[PDB]
Design an enzyme around this catalytic site. Structure first.
Site, PDB file in Angstrom:
ATOM      1  N   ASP A 146       1.511  -0.234  -6.499  1.00  0.00           N
ATOM      2  CA  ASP A 146       1.532   0.044  -5.075  1.00  0.00           C
ATOM      3  C   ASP A 146       2.020   1.486  -4.866  1.00  0.00           C
ATOM      4  O   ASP A 146       2.963   1.708  -4.082  1.00  0.00           O
ATOM      5  CB  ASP A 146       2.446  -0.936  -4.312  1.00  0.00           C
TER       6      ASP A 146
ATOM      7  N   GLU B  59      -4.272  -5.385   3.867  1.00  0.00           N
ATOM      8  CA  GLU B  59      -2.899  -5.002   3.548  1.00  0.00           C
ATOM      9  C   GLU B  59      -2.875  -3.537   3.147  1.00  0.00           C
ATOM     10  O   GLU B  59      -3.891  -2.837   3.310  1.00  0.00           O
ATOM     11  CB  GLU B  59      -2.315  -5.941   2.460  1.00  0.00           C
TER      12      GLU B  59
HETATM   13  O1  LIG Z   1       2.486  -5.729  -5.255  1.00  0.00           O
HETATM   14  C1  LIG Z   1       2.958  -6.681  -4.272  1.00  0.00           C
HETATM   15  C2  LIG Z   1       1.957  -6.817  -3.127  1.00  0.00           C
HETATM   16  O2  LIG Z   1       0.645  -7.001  -3.669  1.00  0.00           O
HETATM   17  C3  LIG Z   1      -0.288  -6.132  -3.000  1.00  0.00           C
HETATM   18  O3  LIG Z   1      -0.637  -5.021  -3.841  1.00  0.00           O
HETATM   19  C4  LIG Z   1       0.461  -5.701  -1.744  1.00  0.00           C
HETATM   20  O4  LIG Z   1      -0.111  -4.527  -1.176  1.00  0.00           O
HETATM   21  C5  LIG Z   1       1.888  -5.580  -2.260  1.00  0.00           C
HETATM   22  O5  LIG Z   1       2.944  -5.547  -1.296  1.00  0.00           O
END
Ligand SMILES: OC[C@@H]1O[C@H](O)[C@H](O)[C@H]1O
Ligand SMILES: OC[C@@H]1O[C@H](O)[C@H](O)[C@H]1O
Ligand SMILES: [Ca+2]
Ligand SMILES: [Ca+2]
Lengths: 504, 504
Positions: free
Chosen positions: B14, B177
């Site tokens: 991320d 997201e």
């Molecule tokens: O890596 C944890 C979660 O998975 C996804 O990549 C999201 O964007 C992140 O907060």
């Protein structure tokens, strides 16, 4: 009215369907299991009854060195003028072949080998002008360009007529495969799978006025996929289209029911159904605009499981498979009438080549499976029992064996390189009942002392450590009866009185 | 010139990037590990040096009950008028918060809690007119519609200004997201992730003349994905865009390097880089038309690993993490100068809450990791050693312990519900060197008697049984030093003289 997907539950991948009159026949891939290529019948596309298998003789089905990564890959079933044709690949031999039948209640022919036709997913199409076309994938042994290849074929000689041509590369997904050619309202349609038979799986389609193209990609490809979704059905594709006798159009295809996170599946790829509508500009749409569900509307289709084998018959039921070709002398329904006698060899469930084992598919997440065994082992290597089996590196088993001259019941697991005896208890009776309760997350392994009826929970095991994602290959979990001498021939016979499969 | 992806190898998901002048700073998610949120510096976007962590105090980082499925999720790093802002979610608390710094070489502030702002992946955008916007996902605790939500924010008070609005649902993939808002040449761009951070992962983009929309989907979405491919880099997305100081545009994003079939990954999600070009109709394209590679062209970027810790310093290096907040009294660099002293508790590597452990990421498929331990256990429960650790149900370890009043070196594994002692040998010296050779398929566990130099291969273990696919959660494998009393406090101290990490 509604139906549920999957329409054929458990390990039933790469479905190919064939209509004859007002009846429907369907086949799936079987890999290293024998007999090979199950075949089903239906009158409504929803409810299927297993009629048997297509490949039942060693000459049809050479499985030496086959594993759950190899053996028999996708089969296609077609019908022309009273003759059924079953065309598939033995990936262990790297050979494509056809077998034929005029009566599905009887046996199929010896293989007709298609010399020089490589790749996987061979398919046949009987064109309205009388020509016959074979379609398939790129041949990995020749190192060909990824894509779909086709030739005219002479079905008598098993030989190509004219030239093998590349007809489509697909939309650009990986592994363009599962090709089927159809002709509908003056257009040829080439239906394929792309993206791989895992989370990127999709169905795409192309069309042309001519059988060899050029083919034009459908502008809204992919026409069926659950890629990039969290739907409970995943990995959808490998479709085959049928027109029901009321005129409406349908596809069969496979999908998984994964659990956990990341998603993991242990019931294999399961056969599903969805309707097709044709657009005004002449393209097929599957399901709800390229997506499908567990619960589906049945359209106009006419809508409508405890299995107990006491081994009284001298024919094996159609539930049972062996790991590769059975060594026939090591199984008997006649030596002790009303029991299955099994002779364990040096080979174990860890070995790929012909261990003494007979098994049936897990077809439900929630079920109770049991058997009664008579076994009195003479030496410490000797073992017989009930297994939950995915492949040679992924299996659990509860069994009778002997350790330092005492009889014990054991729970043993093989997970990758780990081989462990999880629990062990001394046992004092000549017979035992093994009993396994399955739910989505785990298997619970119990045994029963038959004369007392007392039950003892020996241990548990996770489903996810037998999942295809963990284990490898292309199959689903089996429940199996087995015997072994763990490096030596087992001097004691194993006798199984019965087997019960009781889904929730 | 060329660079290699990943640009930051190992467990670094991320990625969010921030330019200040001609220097670049970048942060990743850290879940249950402490300290939390690593931060890197670069001058060329390819070569990153770890500067430390953003969350180093218990007040910043409350990890009680956190696991590799929870704790700290995606962080975003921004800069405005001399102040850096780090915004992220503690999923165990279900709280979003900001910490601030005017100097990255120093420590960050206490958290500013954003009351009432749920979801994950919070992001900040400093608009050219002086307004500040917070953007994030749907709040699962309120059961909101899937999508991207936004409000104006007051950064002093940690409070929303005006109203929270849904600005985009995305293209229709799962889990929209990782939202970031940018303004480029008179357009606002909303960049997001869809499809889930596994094999369906993709990057999509939308635009509008106004910060709250309505947003128009890019007609060639997704603009970056490896879904439905067999590329060695998978699960690509969670992008953040930067403009290099020569004027060219780039994105950072994460991806995996899976092995085996089905694909399985054990080095976590790793930070990658790709160029962006802007189309004439005003849309960004990442990489080679939505796909990227291991080897990339560096454009005009100016192009340019043995780690040995002898524990002489009284500050821990930036390689080391603990599982949740360390119990500080159970580690000491001063009690025995030049060694790390560790006090094992009742907690084991099977327990989530504060086991005595210090670890560093596996950042290479092929590497040799070793340590020297002094340990003389007083009782049979007492154990100290070197672990290859994914999570509480997935870890391998080689250790000294005691069994029936004798000292043994052991190889032990926890895989799901399986807990097994794989091999055991009697050992006679006060110190021991543990040594692990890693390759893509397996770890080889050896020990060395230090005074003789004799080496002994104790056993091996598969990488795929520690993979995220098998184990769960969102992390990569760590190499760790640990001690435990297996249900009791460990009465014997454990002393580690050094640790070596030698990549191939
Ligand atoms: O890596 C944890 C979660 O998975 C996804 O990549 C999201 O964007 C992140 O907060
Ligand atoms: O199931 C085995 C292979 O995977 C793919 O589904 C392909 O079509 C088939 O032959
Ligand atoms: Ca019987
Ligand atoms: Ca030292």
């Amino acid at each position: 009215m509604e139906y549920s997907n999957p329409v054929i539950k458990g390990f039933y991948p790469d479905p190919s369907i064939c209509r004859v009159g007002s009846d429907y026949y369907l086949v799936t891939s079987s890999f290293q299991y024998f007999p090979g290529v199950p075949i089903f019948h239906s009158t409504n596309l929803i409810n299927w009854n297993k009629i048997g298998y297509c490949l039942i003789r060693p000459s049809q089905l050479m499985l030496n060195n086959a594993t759950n990564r190899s053996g028999i890959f996708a089969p296609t079933l077609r019908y022309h003028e009273g003759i059924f044709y079953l065309i598939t690949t033995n990936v262990t031999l790297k050979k494509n072949f056809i077998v034929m039948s005029e009566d599905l209640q009887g046996e199929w022919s010896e293989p007709i080998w298609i010399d020089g036709w490589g790749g996987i997913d061979p398919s046949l199409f009987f064109d309205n002008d009388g020509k016959v076309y074979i379609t398939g994938t790129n041949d990995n042994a020749r190192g060909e360009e990824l894509g779909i290849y086709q030739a005219e074929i002479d079905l008598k000689k098993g030989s190509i007529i004219g030239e093998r041509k590349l007809i489509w590369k697909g939309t650009g997904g990986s592994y363009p495969e599962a090709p089927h050619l159809y002709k509908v309202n003056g257009w040829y349609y080439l239906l394929i799978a792309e993206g791989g038979t895992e989370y990127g799986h999709m169905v795409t389609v192309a069309r042309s006025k001519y059988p060899f193209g050029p083919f034009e990609s459908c502008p809204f490809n992919p026409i069926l996929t659950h890629r990039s979704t969290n739907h409970p059905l995943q990995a959808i594709g490998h479709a085959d289209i049928v027109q029901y006798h009321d005129g409406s159009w349908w596809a069969v295809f496979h999908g998984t029911r994964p659990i956990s996170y990341p998603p993991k599946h242990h019931l294999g790829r399961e056969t599903c159904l969805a309707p097709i509508k044709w657009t005004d500009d002449g393209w097929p749409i599957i399901g709800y605009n390229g997506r499908i569900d567990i619960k589906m509307d049945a359209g106009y289709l006419p809508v409508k499981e405890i299995i107990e084998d006491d081994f009284n018959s001298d024919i094996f039921s159609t539930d049972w498979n062996f790991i590769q070709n059975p060594r026939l002398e090591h199984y008997s329904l006649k030596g002790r009438p009303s029991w299955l006698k099994m002779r364990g060899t040096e080979k174990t469930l860890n070995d790929i080549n012909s261990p003494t084992f007979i098994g049936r598919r897990q077809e439900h997440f929630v079920c109770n499976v049991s058997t009664l065994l008579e076994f009195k082992p003479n030496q410490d290597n000797e073992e017989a029992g009930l297994t939950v089996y995915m492949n040679e590196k992924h299996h659990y088993e509860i069994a009778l064996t002997k350790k330092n001259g005492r009889i014990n019941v054991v729970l043993k697991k093989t997970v990758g390189d780990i081989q462990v005896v999880v629990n062990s208890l001394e046992y004092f009776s000549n017979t035992i009942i093994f009993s396994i309760q399955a739910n989505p997350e785990e298997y619970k392994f119990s045994f029963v002392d038959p004369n007392t009826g007392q039950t003892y929970l020996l241990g548990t095991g996770l489903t996810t450590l037998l999942s295809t994602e963990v284990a490898g290959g292309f199959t689903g979990v089996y429940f199996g009866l087995y015997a072994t001498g763990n490096g030596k021939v087992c001097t004691a016979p194993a006798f199984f009185d019965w087997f019960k499969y009781i889904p929730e």
